[PDB]
Tab-separated table of C-alpha atoms in Angstrom:
chain	number	residue	atom	x	y	z
A	1	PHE	CA	0.000	0.000	0.000
A	2	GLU	CA	1.329	3.406	-1.045
A	3	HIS	CA	0.913	6.752	0.730
A	4	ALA	CA	2.043	10.270	-0.214
A	5	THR	CA	3.071	13.241	1.948
A	6	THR	CA	5.466	16.195	1.679
A	7	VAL	CA	8.569	17.027	3.725
A	8	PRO	CA	10.163	20.496	3.940
A	9	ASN	CA	13.670	20.308	2.477
A	10	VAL	CA	15.574	21.100	5.666
A	11	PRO	CA	18.196	18.482	6.532
A	12	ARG	CA	17.615	15.655	9.041
A	13	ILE	CA	14.086	16.762	9.905
A	14	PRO	CA	11.833	13.732	10.496
A	15	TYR	CA	8.258	13.843	9.285
A	16	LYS	CA	5.571	12.085	11.297
A	17	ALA	CA	2.761	10.745	9.150
A	18	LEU	CA	-0.083	8.278	9.350
A	19	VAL	CA	-0.824	5.668	6.766
A	20	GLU	CA	-4.058	3.794	7.369
A	21	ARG	CA	-6.406	1.375	5.665
A	22	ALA	CA	-9.292	-0.881	6.621
A	23	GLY	CA	-8.769	-3.704	9.091
A	24	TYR	CA	-5.532	-2.191	10.393
A	25	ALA	CA	-4.390	0.438	12.835
A	26	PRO	CA	-3.367	3.855	11.517
A	27	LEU	CA	0.353	3.222	11.522
A	28	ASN	CA	3.258	5.586	12.058
A	29	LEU	CA	5.740	6.728	9.437
A	30	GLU	CA	8.860	8.801	10.143
A	31	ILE	CA	10.831	10.127	7.181
A	32	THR	CA	13.945	12.261	7.717
A	33	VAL	CA	15.775	14.010	4.879
A	34	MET	CA	19.440	13.358	5.703
A	35	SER	CA	22.550	14.979	4.131
A	36	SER	CA	21.402	15.510	0.552
A	37	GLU	CA	23.745	16.899	-2.063
A	38	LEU	CA	22.940	17.846	-5.624
A	39	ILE	CA	25.226	17.092	-8.557
A	40	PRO	CA	25.343	19.051	-11.842
A	41	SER	CA	26.629	17.757	-15.163
A	42	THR	CA	30.059	19.114	-16.071
A	43	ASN	CA	32.533	19.119	-18.944
A	44	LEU	CA	35.909	20.826	-18.734
A	45	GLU	CA	37.082	22.744	-21.755
A	46	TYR	CA	40.580	23.742	-20.755
A	47	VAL	CA	43.213	23.926	-18.046
A	48	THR	CA	45.262	27.104	-17.461
A	49	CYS	CA	48.609	27.805	-15.740
A	50	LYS	CA	51.564	30.146	-15.764
A	51	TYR	CA	53.995	29.972	-18.654
A	52	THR	CA	57.703	29.655	-19.228
A	53	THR	CA	58.698	31.357	-22.448
A	54	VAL	CA	61.159	29.010	-24.087
A	55	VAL	CA	63.687	31.110	-25.981
A	56	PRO	CA	66.323	28.755	-27.430
A	57	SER	CA	69.770	29.602	-28.753
A	58	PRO	CA	69.736	31.521	-32.041
A	59	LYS	CA	70.911	30.756	-35.567
A	60	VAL	CA	73.480	33.094	-37.127
A	61	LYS	CA	75.150	33.169	-40.531
A	62	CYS	CA	77.796	35.601	-41.734
A	63	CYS	CA	77.828	35.299	-45.540
A	64	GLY	CA	74.401	33.921	-46.403
A	65	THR	CA	70.951	34.741	-45.114
A	66	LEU	CA	68.295	32.635	-43.425
A	67	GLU	CA	64.614	31.981	-44.060
A	68	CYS	CA	62.445	30.852	-41.178
A	69	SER	CA	59.484	28.465	-41.273
A	70	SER	CA	56.689	27.537	-38.896
A	71	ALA	CA	56.449	24.604	-36.490
A	72	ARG	CA	53.992	23.161	-33.949
A	73	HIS	CA	54.207	24.955	-30.599
A	74	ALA	CA	52.199	27.610	-28.752
A	75	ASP	CA	52.291	31.386	-29.460
A	76	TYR	CA	55.172	31.967	-31.837
A	77	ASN	CA	57.377	34.561	-32.969
A	78	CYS	CA	60.271	33.961	-35.302
A	79	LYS	CA	62.126	36.666	-37.153
A	80	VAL	CA	65.080	37.135	-39.426
A	81	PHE	CA	66.977	40.260	-38.239
A	82	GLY	CA	69.522	41.560	-40.680
A	83	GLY	CA	73.071	42.853	-40.459
A	84	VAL	CA	73.890	42.387	-36.805
A	85	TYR	CA	77.118	41.975	-34.795
A	86	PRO	CA	79.575	43.582	-37.246
A	87	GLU	CA	76.041	41.150	-44.041
A	88	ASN	CA	75.599	38.868	-41.043
A	89	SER	CA	72.220	37.408	-40.121
A	90	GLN	CA	70.229	36.178	-37.139
A	91	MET	CA	67.138	34.091	-36.459
A	92	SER	CA	65.349	35.037	-33.242
A	93	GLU	CA	62.736	32.447	-32.327
A	94	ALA	CA	60.613	32.093	-29.213
A	95	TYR	CA	57.484	30.351	-27.945
A	96	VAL	CA	55.734	29.417	-24.704
A	97	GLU	CA	54.574	26.235	-23.016
A	98	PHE	CA	53.196	25.149	-19.665
A	99	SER	CA	55.080	25.948	-16.496
A	100	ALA	CA	57.362	23.646	-14.558
A	101	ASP	CA	54.498	22.235	-12.488
A	102	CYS	CA	50.839	22.158	-13.466
A	103	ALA	CA	49.981	18.962	-11.650
A	104	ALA	CA	49.790	21.112	-8.513
A	105	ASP	CA	48.684	24.613	-9.501
A	106	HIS	CA	46.254	24.668	-12.405
A	107	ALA	CA	42.728	25.923	-12.826
A	108	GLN	CA	39.917	24.181	-14.647
A	109	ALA	CA	37.383	26.132	-16.654
A	110	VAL	CA	34.138	24.159	-16.533
A	111	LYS	CA	30.632	24.716	-17.876
A	112	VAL	CA	27.777	23.687	-15.573
A	113	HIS	CA	24.412	22.421	-16.795
A	114	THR	CA	21.444	21.117	-14.767
A	115	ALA	CA	21.687	19.087	-11.580
A	116	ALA	CA	20.565	15.784	-10.069
A	117	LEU	CA	18.874	15.647	-6.654
A	118	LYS	CA	20.242	12.886	-4.385
A	119	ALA	CA	18.794	12.511	-0.889
A	120	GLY	CA	19.504	10.603	2.306
A	121	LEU	CA	16.181	9.610	3.922
A	122	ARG	CA	15.937	7.707	7.211
A	123	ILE	CA	12.615	5.884	7.365
A	124	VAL	CA	11.192	4.386	10.557
A	125	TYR	CA	7.811	2.698	10.750
A	126	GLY	CA	6.625	0.259	13.379
A	127	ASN	CA	9.949	-1.173	14.527
A	128	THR	CA	11.652	-0.936	11.120
A	129	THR	CA	14.456	1.637	10.955
A	130	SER	CA	15.863	1.867	7.435
A	131	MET	CA	18.744	3.835	5.942
A	132	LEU	CA	18.282	4.621	2.268
A	133	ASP	CA	18.543	7.344	-0.358
A	134	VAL	CA	16.652	8.270	-3.494
A	135	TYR	CA	17.188	10.285	-6.645
A	136	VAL	CA	14.447	12.872	-6.263
A	137	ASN	CA	12.172	12.429	-9.272
A	138	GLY	CA	8.807	10.793	-9.688
A	139	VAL	CA	10.071	7.537	-11.222
A	140	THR	CA	13.081	6.148	-9.340
A	141	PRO	CA	12.127	3.666	-6.583
A	142	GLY	CA	13.914	4.012	-3.258
A	143	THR	CA	14.410	0.438	-2.151
A	144	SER	CA	15.108	-0.677	1.394
A	145	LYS	CA	14.761	-4.312	2.529
A	146	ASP	CA	11.079	-4.564	1.615
A	147	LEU	CA	9.785	-1.105	0.629
A	148	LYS	CA	9.763	1.298	-2.295
A	149	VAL	CA	9.994	5.090	-2.165
A	150	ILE	CA	9.533	7.722	-4.849
A	151	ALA	CA	10.456	11.304	-3.984
A	152	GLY	CA	8.435	13.640	-6.172
A	153	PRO	CA	10.135	16.559	-7.899
A	154	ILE	CA	10.893	19.783	-6.070
A	155	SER	CA	8.290	22.548	-5.872
A	156	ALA	CA	10.949	25.090	-6.922
A	157	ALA	CA	14.322	24.500	-8.561
A	158	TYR	CA	17.560	26.106	-7.406
A	159	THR	CA	21.258	26.023	-8.248
A	160	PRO	CA	24.076	27.564	-6.229
A	161	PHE	CA	26.273	27.378	-9.319
A	162	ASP	CA	26.162	29.370	-12.522
A	163	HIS	CA	26.580	28.564	-16.179
A	164	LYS	CA	30.375	28.919	-16.242
A	165	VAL	CA	32.689	28.165	-13.338
A	166	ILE	CA	36.366	27.881	-12.370
A	167	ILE	CA	37.837	25.224	-10.112
A	168	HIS	CA	41.140	26.126	-8.474
A	169	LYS	CA	42.949	23.941	-5.903
A	170	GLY	CA	39.799	23.400	-3.910
A	171	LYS	CA	37.580	26.399	-4.283
A	172	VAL	CA	34.784	27.234	-6.696
A	173	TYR	CA	34.307	30.716	-8.147
A	174	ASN	CA	31.657	32.183	-10.438
A	175	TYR	CA	33.564	33.840	-13.276
A	176	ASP	CA	33.107	34.174	-17.031
A	177	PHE	CA	36.109	32.588	-18.646
A	178	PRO	CA	36.757	33.174	-22.354
A	179	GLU	CA	35.783	30.366	-24.709
A	180	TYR	CA	38.140	27.710	-26.007
A	181	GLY	CA	40.187	29.396	-28.719
A	182	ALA	CA	39.047	32.953	-27.996
A	183	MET	CA	41.936	33.795	-25.689
A	184	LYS	CA	42.717	37.453	-24.854
A	185	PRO	CA	46.187	38.260	-23.513
A	186	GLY	CA	46.716	39.489	-20.006
A	187	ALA	CA	43.470	37.966	-18.765
A	188	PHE	CA	42.383	34.587	-17.500
A	189	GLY	CA	42.817	31.833	-20.007
A	190	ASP	CA	45.945	32.621	-21.965
A	191	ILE	CA	47.273	29.120	-22.239
A	192	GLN	CA	44.701	26.501	-23.166
A	193	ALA	CA	44.939	22.721	-23.390
A	194	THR	CA	42.312	20.006	-23.270
A	195	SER	CA	44.023	18.142	-20.430
A	196	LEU	CA	47.171	18.328	-18.348
A	197	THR	CA	49.008	16.074	-20.801
A	198	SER	CA	47.256	16.521	-24.136
A	199	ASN	CA	48.875	18.415	-26.962
A	200	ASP	CA	47.481	21.327	-29.024
A	201	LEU	CA	48.401	24.195	-26.770
A	202	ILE	CA	46.866	27.554	-27.663
A	203	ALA	CA	48.238	30.918	-26.585
A	204	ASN	CA	48.151	34.679	-26.962
A	205	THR	CA	50.761	36.574	-25.010
A	206	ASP	CA	51.586	39.685	-27.149
A	207	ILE	CA	55.151	38.479	-27.423
A	208	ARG	CA	57.230	40.857	-29.533
A	209	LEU	CA	60.769	40.033	-30.586
A	210	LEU	CA	63.226	42.902	-30.861
A	211	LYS	CA	66.331	43.677	-32.860
A	212	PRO	CA	69.524	42.685	-31.052
A	213	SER	CA	71.952	45.544	-30.627
A	214	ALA	CA	74.909	44.777	-28.349
A	215	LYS	CA	78.430	43.367	-28.314
A	216	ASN	CA	77.480	39.822	-27.285
A	217	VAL	CA	74.790	37.529	-28.623
A	218	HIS	CA	71.363	37.957	-27.089
A	219	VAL	CA	67.792	37.579	-28.214
A	220	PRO	CA	65.531	40.258	-26.739
A	221	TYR	CA	61.758	40.351	-26.406
A	222	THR	CA	58.856	41.920	-24.559
A	223	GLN	CA	55.618	40.373	-23.493
A	224	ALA	CA	52.361	40.813	-21.624
A	225	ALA	CA	52.226	39.419	-18.110
A	226	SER	CA	50.815	36.077	-17.042
A	227	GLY	CA	47.095	36.612	-16.968
A	228	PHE	CA	46.571	33.697	-14.643
A	229	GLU	CA	48.688	35.531	-12.071
A	230	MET	CA	46.536	38.632	-12.460
A	231	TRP	CA	43.507	36.669	-11.423
A	232	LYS	CA	45.037	35.201	-8.283
A	233	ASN	CA	45.581	38.779	-7.178
A	234	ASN	CA	41.987	39.701	-7.874
A	235	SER	CA	39.924	36.556	-7.385
A	236	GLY	CA	37.144	37.380	-4.965
A	237	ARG	CA	35.766	35.040	-2.407
A	238	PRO	CA	34.655	31.536	-3.419
A	239	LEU	CA	31.270	29.845	-3.384
A	240	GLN	CA	31.857	28.309	0.027
A	241	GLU	CA	31.345	31.830	1.356
A	242	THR	CA	28.803	33.450	-0.983
A	243	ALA	CA	26.339	30.647	-1.775
A	244	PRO	CA	22.641	31.465	-1.304
A	245	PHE	CA	21.388	28.534	0.796
A	246	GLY	CA	24.166	27.491	3.156
A	247	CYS	CA	25.294	24.750	0.841
A	248	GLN	CA	28.901	23.776	1.110
A	249	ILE	CA	30.702	22.723	-2.055
A	250	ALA	CA	32.868	19.646	-2.380
A	251	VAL	CA	34.869	18.876	-5.502
A	252	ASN	CA	35.805	15.480	-6.171
A	253	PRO	CA	32.798	15.307	-8.584
A	254	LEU	CA	31.708	18.964	-7.922
A	255	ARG	CA	28.698	18.458	-5.698
A	256	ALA	CA	26.826	21.054	-3.642
A	257	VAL	CA	25.980	19.750	-0.195
A	258	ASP	CA	23.277	20.451	2.413
A	259	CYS	CA	20.941	22.964	0.866
A	260	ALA	CA	17.822	24.208	2.616
A	261	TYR	CA	15.077	25.322	0.241
A	262	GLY	CA	11.623	24.180	-0.741
A	263	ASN	CA	9.849	20.933	0.002
A	264	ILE	CA	9.970	17.391	-1.370
A	265	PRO	CA	6.791	15.440	-2.128
A	266	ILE	CA	7.301	11.846	-1.090
A	267	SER	CA	5.516	8.528	-1.525
A	268	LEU	CA	6.117	5.210	0.183
A	269	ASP	CA	4.794	1.768	-0.711
A	270	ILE	CA	4.509	0.237	2.749
A	271	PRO	CA	5.337	-3.497	2.866
A	272	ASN	CA	2.353	-5.649	3.744
A	273	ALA	CA	3.995	-7.405	6.707
A	274	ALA	CA	4.123	-4.175	8.749
A	275	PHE	CA	0.390	-3.687	9.243
A	276	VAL	CA	-0.853	-4.016	12.818
A	277	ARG	CA	-4.580	-4.721	13.064
A	278	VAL	CA	-7.348	-2.997	15.002
A	279	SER	CA	-7.558	-5.976	17.359
A	280	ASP	CA	-3.971	-5.540	18.538
A	281	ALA	CA	-4.395	-1.748	18.381
A	282	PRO	CA	-5.210	-0.512	21.904
A	283	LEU	CA	-8.385	1.493	21.421
A	284	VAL	CA	-8.685	4.302	23.960
A	285	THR	CA	-11.794	6.347	24.741
A	286	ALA	CA	-12.488	9.309	27.049
A	287	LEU	CA	-9.634	11.343	25.596
A	288	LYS	CA	-8.841	14.436	27.658
A	289	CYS	CA	-6.220	16.922	26.473
A	290	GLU	CA	-4.509	19.145	29.043
A	291	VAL	CA	-2.214	21.695	27.435
A	292	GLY	CA	0.789	23.034	29.335
A	293	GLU	CA	3.191	25.691	28.068
A	294	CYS	CA	3.072	25.871	24.245
A	295	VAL	CA	5.897	28.343	23.798
A	296	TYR	CA	6.069	28.115	20.071
A	297	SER	CA	8.468	27.930	17.118
A	298	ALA	CA	11.630	26.555	18.660
A	299	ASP	CA	11.893	22.764	18.605
A	300	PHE	CA	9.457	21.108	20.982
A	301	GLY	CA	8.179	24.021	22.993
A	302	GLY	CA	4.781	22.586	23.868
A	303	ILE	CA	3.825	20.139	26.619
A	304	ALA	CA	0.488	18.347	26.471
A	305	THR	CA	-0.810	15.560	28.685
A	306	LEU	CA	-3.574	13.045	28.030
A	307	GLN	CA	-5.917	11.772	30.705
A	308	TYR	CA	-7.676	8.765	29.276
A	309	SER	CA	-9.165	5.316	29.865
A	310	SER	CA	-7.831	2.435	27.800
A	311	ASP	CA	-8.866	-0.967	26.596
A	312	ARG	CA	-5.374	-2.462	26.467
A	313	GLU	CA	-1.715	-1.759	27.255
A	314	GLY	CA	0.643	-1.299	24.332
A	315	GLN	CA	2.390	1.135	22.054
A	316	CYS	CA	-0.097	3.312	20.176
A	317	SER	CA	0.390	5.483	17.090
A	318	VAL	CA	-0.096	9.098	18.105
A	319	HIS	CA	-0.543	11.759	15.448
A	320	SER	CA	-1.581	15.342	14.804
A	321	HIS	CA	-3.563	16.086	11.663
A	322	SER	CA	-3.615	19.843	11.141
A	323	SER	CA	-0.425	21.204	9.612
A	324	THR	CA	-0.147	23.975	12.215
A	325	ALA	CA	1.639	21.572	14.577
A	326	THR	CA	3.440	18.242	14.580
A	327	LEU	CA	4.148	16.026	17.544
A	328	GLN	CA	7.045	13.806	18.560
A	329	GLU	CA	7.917	10.190	19.485
A	330	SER	CA	4.771	8.848	17.809
A	331	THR	CA	4.162	5.778	20.061
A	332	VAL	CA	2.705	5.635	23.583
A	333	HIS	CA	2.529	2.512	25.749
A	334	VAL	CA	-0.827	2.938	27.508
A	335	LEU	CA	-2.179	1.839	30.904
A	336	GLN	CA	-5.631	1.506	32.520
A	337	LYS	CA	-5.345	5.078	33.820
A	338	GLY	CA	-2.420	7.010	32.374
A	339	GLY	CA	-1.130	10.537	31.977
A	340	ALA	CA	1.411	10.293	29.155
A	341	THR	CA	2.884	13.427	27.602
A	342	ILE	CA	3.427	14.618	24.030
A	343	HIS	CA	5.491	17.503	22.592
A	344	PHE	CA	3.605	19.978	20.415
A	345	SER	CA	5.830	22.068	18.155
A	346	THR	CA	3.719	24.751	16.511
A	347	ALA	CA	4.875	27.880	14.685
A	348	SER	CA	1.713	29.907	15.245
A	349	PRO	CA	0.098	31.489	18.329
A	350	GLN	CA	-2.858	29.040	18.306
A	351	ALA	CA	-2.523	25.462	19.544
A	352	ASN	CA	-5.644	24.404	17.666
A	353	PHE	CA	-5.030	20.834	16.590
A	354	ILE	CA	-6.451	17.312	16.516
A	355	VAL	CA	-4.757	14.386	18.248
A	356	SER	CA	-5.518	10.877	17.047
A	357	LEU	CA	-4.205	8.584	19.767
A	358	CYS	CA	-4.839	5.430	17.768
A	359	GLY	CA	-6.962	7.075	15.104
A	360	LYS	CA	-9.533	8.190	17.693
A	361	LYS	CA	-9.551	11.971	17.423
A	362	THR	CA	-9.747	14.663	20.100
A	363	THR	CA	-8.832	18.342	20.252
A	364	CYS	CA	-6.053	20.369	21.871
A	365	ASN	CA	-6.937	24.056	22.179
A	366	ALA	CA	-4.817	26.729	23.859
A	367	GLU	CA	-2.973	29.944	23.112
A	368	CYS	CA	0.778	30.192	22.656
A	369	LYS	CA	3.532	32.426	23.988
A	370	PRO	CA	6.414	33.935	21.995
A	371	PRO	CA	9.806	32.729	23.217
A	372	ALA	CA	12.564	34.858	24.649
A	373	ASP	CA	15.524	33.532	22.679
A	374	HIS	CA	16.200	35.385	19.466
A	375	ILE	CA	18.556	32.986	17.685
A	376	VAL	CA	18.853	29.181	17.722
A	377	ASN	CA	21.352	26.891	15.972
A	378	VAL	CA	18.727	24.241	15.213
A	379	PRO	CA	16.589	24.856	12.082
A	380	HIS	CA	12.804	25.179	11.965
A	381	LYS	CA	10.312	22.324	11.622
A	382	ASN	CA	7.097	24.063	10.505
A	383	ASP	CA	5.815	26.709	8.110
A	384	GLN	CA	3.679	29.829	8.342
A	385	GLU	CA	0.011	29.882	7.369
A	386	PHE	CA	-2.165	32.909	6.895
A	387	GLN	CA	-5.531	32.390	8.634
A	388	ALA	CA	-3.400	30.600	11.256
A	389	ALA	CA	-0.710	33.144	12.225
A	390	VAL	CA	-3.329	35.707	13.281
A	391	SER	CA	-4.253	35.516	16.967
A	392	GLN	CA	-7.823	34.766	18.008
A	393	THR	CA	-8.419	38.000	19.918
A	394	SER	CA	-7.240	39.903	16.862
A	395	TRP	CA	-9.734	37.837	14.859
A	396	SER	CA	-12.403	38.993	17.309
A	397	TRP	CA	-11.397	42.644	16.891
A	398	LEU	CA	-11.288	42.425	13.083
A	399	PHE	CA	-14.608	40.570	12.817
A	400	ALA	CA	-16.299	42.955	15.259
A	401	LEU	CA	-14.995	46.017	13.427
A	402	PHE	CA	-16.014	44.674	10.009
A	403	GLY	CA	-19.458	43.800	11.362
A	404	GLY	CA	-19.767	47.272	12.855
A	405	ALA	CA	-18.865	48.693	9.453
A	406	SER	CA	-21.258	46.437	7.501
A	407	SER	CA	-24.400	46.046	9.622
A	408	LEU	CA	-25.326	49.726	9.468
A	409	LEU	CA	-25.060	49.599	5.666
A	410	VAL	CA	-27.446	46.636	5.867
A	411	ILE	CA	-29.734	48.790	8.043
A	412	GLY	CA	-29.569	51.583	5.458
A	413	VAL	CA	-30.534	49.408	2.505
A	414	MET	CA	-33.351	47.907	4.576
A	415	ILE	CA	-34.429	51.502	5.274
A	416	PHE	CA	-34.555	51.945	1.481
A	417	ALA	CA	-36.770	48.855	1.241
A	418	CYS	CA	-39.012	49.903	4.146
A	419	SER	CA	-39.416	53.447	2.811
A	420	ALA	CA	-40.267	52.068	-0.625
A	421	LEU	CA	-42.877	49.707	0.809
A	422	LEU	CA	-44.562	52.132	3.210
A	423	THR	CA	-44.532	55.402	1.186
B	1	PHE	CA	19.742	33.120	31.972
B	2	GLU	CA	19.210	36.852	32.399
B	3	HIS	CA	16.805	38.156	35.031
B	4	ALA	CA	16.365	41.576	36.614
B	5	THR	CA	14.622	42.575	39.845
B	6	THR	CA	14.775	45.323	42.498
B	7	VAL	CA	16.172	44.470	45.929
B	8	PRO	CA	15.084	46.895	48.660
B	9	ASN	CA	18.029	48.398	50.506
B	10	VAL	CA	17.301	47.322	54.069
B	11	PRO	CA	19.954	44.999	55.536
B	12	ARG	CA	19.106	41.389	56.425
B	13	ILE	CA	15.545	41.365	55.143
B	14	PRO	CA	15.299	38.610	52.512
B	15	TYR	CA	13.684	39.158	49.144
B	16	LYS	CA	11.732	36.423	47.362
B	17	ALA	CA	11.512	35.933	43.604
B	18	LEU	CA	10.815	33.360	40.899
B	19	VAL	CA	13.044	32.773	37.899
B	20	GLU	CA	11.540	30.697	35.104
B	21	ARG	CA	12.696	29.813	31.626
B	22	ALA	CA	9.932	28.922	29.182
B	23	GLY	CA	10.484	25.191	28.977
B	24	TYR	CA	11.563	24.748	32.570
B	25	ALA	CA	10.053	24.544	36.001
B	26	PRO	CA	10.284	27.801	37.989
B	27	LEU	CA	12.798	28.082	40.775
B	28	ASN	CA	13.245	30.038	43.977
B	29	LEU	CA	15.336	33.153	44.458
B	30	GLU	CA	16.144	34.465	47.935
B	31	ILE	CA	18.418	37.507	47.796
B	32	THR	CA	19.641	39.353	50.893
B	33	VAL	CA	21.906	42.350	51.387
B	34	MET	CA	23.950	41.525	54.454
B	35	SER	CA	26.332	44.501	54.608
B	36	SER	CA	26.549	47.861	52.930
B	37	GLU	CA	29.453	50.174	53.564
B	38	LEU	CA	29.632	53.300	51.460
B	39	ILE	CA	32.913	55.146	51.130
B	40	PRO	CA	33.243	58.863	50.371
B	41	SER	CA	36.179	60.436	48.553
B	42	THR	CA	38.361	62.340	50.991
B	43	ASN	CA	41.472	64.469	51.271
B	44	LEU	CA	43.009	66.235	54.245
B	45	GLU	CA	43.687	69.957	54.454
B	46	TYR	CA	45.380	70.331	57.819
B	47	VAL	CA	46.070	68.796	61.218
B	48	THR	CA	45.478	70.596	64.524
B	49	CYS	CA	46.757	70.245	68.101
């Protein structure tokens, strides 16, 4: 049997839910969304470094002249300077390549497309505690020892990343690298290669050979600076420190970890062997709710007790139905006269909810107090609802004022009717 | 936990109070002022015999 709920996408928050059918007790279901990364599809174009301009020893004739051809390296220059060192000749030739060490210090320019949605769910029902995970989409079954789980797609998509991205040593930056082959000198991406060891280097460096003019042999040149070094000066702060939802970023496969946004619809095919019947279910009548504090919004800031009268003694399946509050611990071992306690956890000033102890419903009704603690490490566990976040006395004032503004208009139009009928 | 009351300044008369944190049982608070010297700021001009 399959049941669907929704869980807010805040990590390691269990969701209490009932799943019920005929002939069986309404049974508990606890689903916690554990550490859940998301993984986008990548493809590196190129890898950048510093450069060492190889300038080899020159070629010089004295009687004849030289003519210089091309080769296969990076950014060339080669030139054929005339009567030098007194019709002598010279061949000044220079190129670049990767630095002495790009296994250690090298960037990776990467394009980032859409992202998968792995999860981590812990699922407890009855006495079955299962560790699993599920690709969040409506088709992939999440299979523990006997069950199946489909996590429906997210109500709103999100990416911490961007379309283009740079991976340094460990950090991830959002920056618009130039395309493969469109290199501009003195900026990021001067050298380009499709791996650390592939060939077909590509380079602009504005290298300009110059005419030698000296007493001893030298080959002079001038050149724009290493535009990878002028990014390390001016790289900002990475995505571990500017990301919009608290997600860390790990790069062995470039995943973004532990987001907190939206809510996941979820569906569980419950295995047939975990279905306790209404005979074994301890039915309890004369339900009496006695509400204690209800200081709302923190974690479990509401105490409620239940005075009751049972049929049997055994672990029930306690549940709240209205989404203004959820309870905790979900199972109560009852007695002939007991006073067991729950933990309401609302995020609204009105404890106005319906407890089903073993399906048998009753009502908890009280007002709530705002807490005096401004900031808590632990995340929230509820949502806000209009027509539920407005206090009841304020409802009385608004309804009374609207009635006082409407009823006299009703009196006036009835005065129209009465004056028309009497004349 | 922060709490603020007003002791009356009469020595050795105890003052009763409750401190409670929302989510905790209240607890007692007996505060007494058992000595109060107050010291002015002095200097000497001269000494006479």
